[PDB]
């Protein structure tokens, strides 16, 4: 640009006109085994629709995601991919973690049986069998009702979905932990599913 002033009328001058960001996420080996098993379908939703550089240090058991400034100008995408890998590593399935990528209002809540009501040993065992139900039937009922997804660890219980959805699922599973019979659980279940289907 050359430099020269143009003096307009009333003496007025006249001119003429003239960063990566990364995140790291660990993975446990029991979760790394299906990660290695189904790694192939993990990156195609993100590297193509979010344009996020991926690396995975099996030396460090972690995954790295880098936003390039010219290739990507999208603020929440690295964060969304972080939520995606967090959900999967927490134990949720690939399609529901992708569902979390599709939406932005999908939220996770985890909690513990000792946080709600501490129980011991075989009491905890019978309680886990109760909250599971016969062959996860009750868990499926909860998931279908609240439209939520549940992950049942030893004590960590993870619930993915909408805010009030996981709220309702939390109230239900708190009832199960405290000792609710599954029939009255089913009664309240079709009640809450009735109002949620009516809305």
């Amino acid at each position: 640009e050359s430099k020269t002033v143009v003096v307009d009328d009333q003496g007025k001058p006249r001119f003429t006109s003239a960063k990566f960001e990364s995140r790291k996420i660990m993975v446990p080996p029991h979760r790394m085994t299906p990660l290695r098993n189904s790694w192939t379908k993990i990156y195609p939703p993100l590297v193509e629709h979010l344009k996020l550089q991926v690396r995975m240090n099996l030396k460090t058991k972690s995954v790295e995601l880098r936003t390039n400034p010219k290739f990507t100008t999208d603020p929440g995408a690295l964060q969304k991919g972080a939520d995606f890998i967090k959900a999967f590593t927490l134990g949720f399935d690939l399609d529901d973690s992708i569902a979390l990528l599709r939406l932005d209002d999908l939220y996770i809540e985890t909690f513990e049986v000792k946080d709600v009501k501490t129980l011991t040993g075989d009491h905890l065992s019978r309680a886990i069998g109760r909250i599971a139900g016969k062959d996860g039937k009750t868990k499926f009922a909860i998931e279908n009702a609240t439209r939520t997804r549940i992950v049942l660890a030893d004590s960590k219980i993870h619930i993915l979905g909408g805010f009030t959805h996981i709220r309702m699922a939390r109230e239900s599973v708190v009832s199960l932990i405290l000792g609710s019979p599954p029939g009255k659980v089913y009664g309240n279940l079709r009640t809450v599913a009735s109002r949620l289907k009516e809305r």
Partner: peptide, 15 residues
């Protein structure tokens, strides 16, 4: 069975 990922940076920018 060549896996971008574990090896080096697998991204849209470069490799």
């Amino acid at each position: 069975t060549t896996l971008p990922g574990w090896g080096e940076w697998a991204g849209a920018g470069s490799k």
